Amino acid sequence: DPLAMDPVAGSSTAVATAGQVNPIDPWIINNFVQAPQGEFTISPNNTPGDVLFDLSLGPHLNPFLLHLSQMYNGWVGNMRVRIMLAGNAFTAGKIIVSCIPPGFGSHNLTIAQATLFPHVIADVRTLDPIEVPLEDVRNVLFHNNDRNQQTMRLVCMLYTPLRTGGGTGDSFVVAGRVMTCPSPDFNFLFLVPAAAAAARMVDLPVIQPRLCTHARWPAPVYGLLVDPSLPSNPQWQNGRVHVDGTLLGTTPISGSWVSCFAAEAAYEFQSGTGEVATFTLIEQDGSAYVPGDRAAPLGYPDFSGQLEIEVQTETTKTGDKLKVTTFEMILGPTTNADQAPYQGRVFASVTAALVDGRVRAVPRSIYGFQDTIPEYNDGLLVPLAPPIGPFLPGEVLLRFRTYMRQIDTADAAAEAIDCALPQEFVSWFASNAFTVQSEALLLRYRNTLTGQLLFECKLYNEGYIALSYSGSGPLTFPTDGIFEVVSWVPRLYQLASVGSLATGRMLK
């Protein structure tokens, strides 16, 4: 039957107020084309009341009109919608298409209430299309290019439950299509050169944590956790970057650089018993190191304890003869007391407890690890990326974790070391140099295989991730494991925390 509505006027309203009244090509006027929001699906997974689609009047409902939209700044007029359903003889059901006037707002409507608006109902079996006029109910003379305007909408809902019979293959869905064309009342308004204007955003790579490279110790990432009893605001110098691409601290691009160094090596004689190698540091790509605006050469260790390093002749060409020695070097402050990576000079000793000229040192194990920064400049202030933070109340740092070999001395055992982003995300942000638009990004961590959402989190623009968690209590997450953006997100955005995954509930 016809809609319970009176015909709405077109251009006649905005004549004495718009600067121009611009007509459209009559060939568009009645050619039914697939709307940009031209698809939907109904499946037994849907429940009566589910909104299959929600359209709002505007030139954005027709591809042609849309193209013209980029040329004018206003519009007025009525459109015409046509809906199609590709059902079976096995698909029983009914859909409701209702016109919701502007000003009504948003509410949860029961299928019964959906009927109270001018509507059209159709059985999912129909071979023929359904037609519904989308009138331009106006409170104002006309419309401007603004999707913040409240225009009349078309809401399609499942009126009755979809009930497939026969050999019920739940992989069966009814395909729906929406098509439109403008009623001859339609008119664009002011001619504006506005022909082109877009933007961009930030995305993350779909790499699971357990496929990633760790940014502070050169090993795969093995763990993904939060742990309120660890230091909340660590002062990590590696694995630091901002979402905008700004690298901080000693953060290298390559994960092969992480916790490694290069030097010219020699054996001076202060004590005079040549067991101590003196390393004059160079950058690991063989270029000269100059004390600058970071604490040490790129990737130089940003923690303490006693590091066992293996030092080999630098490889320049095939046939370069190689010497390889092991040393222990002390990373922390102690004590009367030499070592200033920042100035370019560190000492290790031949775990006497061979090699010289130019060498490369890689980490072999740690002894007495402590995750605090070494004394980089022998007492003097030094340039440092800032402590990670702040966090809202109840927010804690998301940790990517790997294990160092710690030695002993009658016993080597795994020791945990954490970082704020995997090296792939370090490289990703340094490379994209995204434009940042607000203070943090809302991310979901999801299992893309199973579909399961594990949690939500905040990626602050300064390059660290927060979760809300009250426990006390390291909490560990599956590492397989993809992150997705979001939103932007103000900094006081409240994240969701959690529940006892048990759902059941009783009528009571």
Choice from 380, 392, 412, 496 touching a second copy (CB under 8 A): 392
- Sequence-distant (≥ 6) Cβ neighbours of residue 278 within 8 angstroms: 265, 266, 267, 268, 345, 347
Residue 411 annotated as binding site: yes
Nearer to a second copy, 112 or 492 (CB): 492
- Number of helices (H), then strands (E), belonging to the chain: the values are 3, 28
Tokens (6 digits) for 501: 């995954």
Choice from 161, 390, 471, 473 touching a second copy (CB under 8 A): 390
Q: How far is the CB of 493 from a second copy (least distance, A)?
A: 12
DSSP calls for 446-485: E-TTT--EEEEEEEETTTEEEEE---SS-EE--SS-EEEE
Tokens (6 digits) for 217: 């110790």
The number of residues that bind a second copy (CB under 8 A) is: 8
501 interacts with a second copy by CB under 8 A: no
Question: What strand order describes the sheet that includes 413-419?
Answer: 413-419, 399-406, 223-226, 475-476
403 interacts with a second copy by CB under 8 A: no
For residue 91, how many other CB atoms are within 10 A of its CB? Answer: 22
**What's the distance, Cα to Cα, between the start and end of the chain in Å?**
45
Alpha-carbon distances of 11 from 26, 79, 151, 437, 439, rounded to whole Å: 15, 13, 16, 39, 44
DSSP calls for 158-184: E-S--EE-SS--TT--EEEEEEEEE-T
Residue numbers 476-495 binding a second copy by CB under 8 A: 492
Piece in contact with a second copy (CB under 8 A), picked from 28-36, 266-274, 384-392, 439-447: 384-392
395 interacts with a second copy by CB under 8 A: yes
394 interacts with a second copy by CB under 8 A: yes
Which residue in 475, 393, 468, 465 sits closest to 240, CA to CA? Answer: 465
Nearer to a second copy, 391 or 488 (CB): 391
Q: How far is the CB of 417 from a second copy (least distance, A)?
A: 26
Piece in contact with a second copy (CB under 8 A), picked from 197-205, 219-227, 370-378, 391-399: 391-399
Nearer to a second copy, 105 or 490 (CB): 490
Piece in contact with a second copy (CB under 8 A), picked from 47-55, 99-107, 389-397, 476-484: 389-397
For residue 103, how many other CB atoms are within 10 A of its CB? Answer: 9
Nearer to a second copy, 368 or 394 (CB): 394
Q: How far is the CB of 399 from a second copy (least distance, A)?
A: 19
Judge whether 298 and 387 are in contact, CB under 8 Å.
no
Choice from 389, 444, 480, 497 touching a second copy (CB under 8 A): 389
Q: How far is the CB of 462 from a second copy (least distance, A)?
A: 12
Residue 408 annotated as binding site: yes
Q: How far is the CB of 391 from a second copy (least distance, A)?
A: 7
DSSP calls for 58-96: SGGGSHHHHHHHTTBSEEE--EEEEEEEE--SSEE-EEE
Binding residues for Ca(2+), by number, are: 406, 408, 415
Binding residues for Mg(2+), by number, are: 406, 408, 411, 415
Binding residues, by number, are: 406, 408, 411, 415
Contact set with a second copy (CB under 8 A) = 389-395, 492
